[PDB]
Design a protein around this nucleic acid. Sequence first.
RNA 1: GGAUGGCGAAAGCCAUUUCCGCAGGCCCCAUUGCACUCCGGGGUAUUGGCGUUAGGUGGUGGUACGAGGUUCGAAUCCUCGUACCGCAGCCA
Length: 92
Amino acid sequence: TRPNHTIYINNLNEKIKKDELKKSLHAIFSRFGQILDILVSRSLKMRGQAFVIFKEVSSATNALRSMQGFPFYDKPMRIQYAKTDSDIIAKM
RNA sequence: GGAUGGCGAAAGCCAUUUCCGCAGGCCCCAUUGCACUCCGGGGUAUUGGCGUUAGGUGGUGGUACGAGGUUCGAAUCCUCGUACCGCAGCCA
Ligand SMILES: [K+]
Ligand SMILES: [Mg+2]
Ligand SMILES: [Mg+2]
Ligand SMILES: [Mg+2]
Ligand SMILES: [Mg+2]
Ligand SMILES: [Mg+2]
Ligand SMILES: [Mg+2]
Ligand SMILES: [Mg+2]
Ligand SMILES: [Mg+2]
């Protein structure tokens, strides 16, 4: 557990189309602090996972302790910090 | 794409097709995966469109050619249109 600007989320319902997932994720997470970006992919290795990048590490960390396990589409979210800064954060 | 026919030396472009295929509907298998350019696979439906970067309307930049205007005349500047290309969305 090494605090990062980006929370990593897996165990997401894989049926949900992309656009919808982002929309829903943004509604739930944008209320923990300002969000800079949400990355969703439905590649063989990326599906079921989502990368939410807050603007301040204090937000990401708060979202984590709070949304951990939260129902989402009949599936508990499993959240963690992202093993590595996100492209936009690092350049900055 | 294959085949067949048309102009061609090919490139290509056109056409046809109860050959194969693509996006869109609907099901099924597989994946618990730490990424930032994308990207598993299969069955069935399969009109129309397209042809592996594989559908469409209208829209924004571009490339191409055309028209009107600019001008003495323009290959310049201006706008309009069309074909295509990367693009966002929406629809299939
Ligand atoms: K045919
Ligand atoms: Mg052929
Ligand atoms: Mg021929
Ligand atoms: Mg001939
Ligand atoms: Mg041909
Ligand atoms: Mg299909
Ligand atoms: Mg298929
Ligand atoms: Mg002229
Ligand atoms: Mg004149």
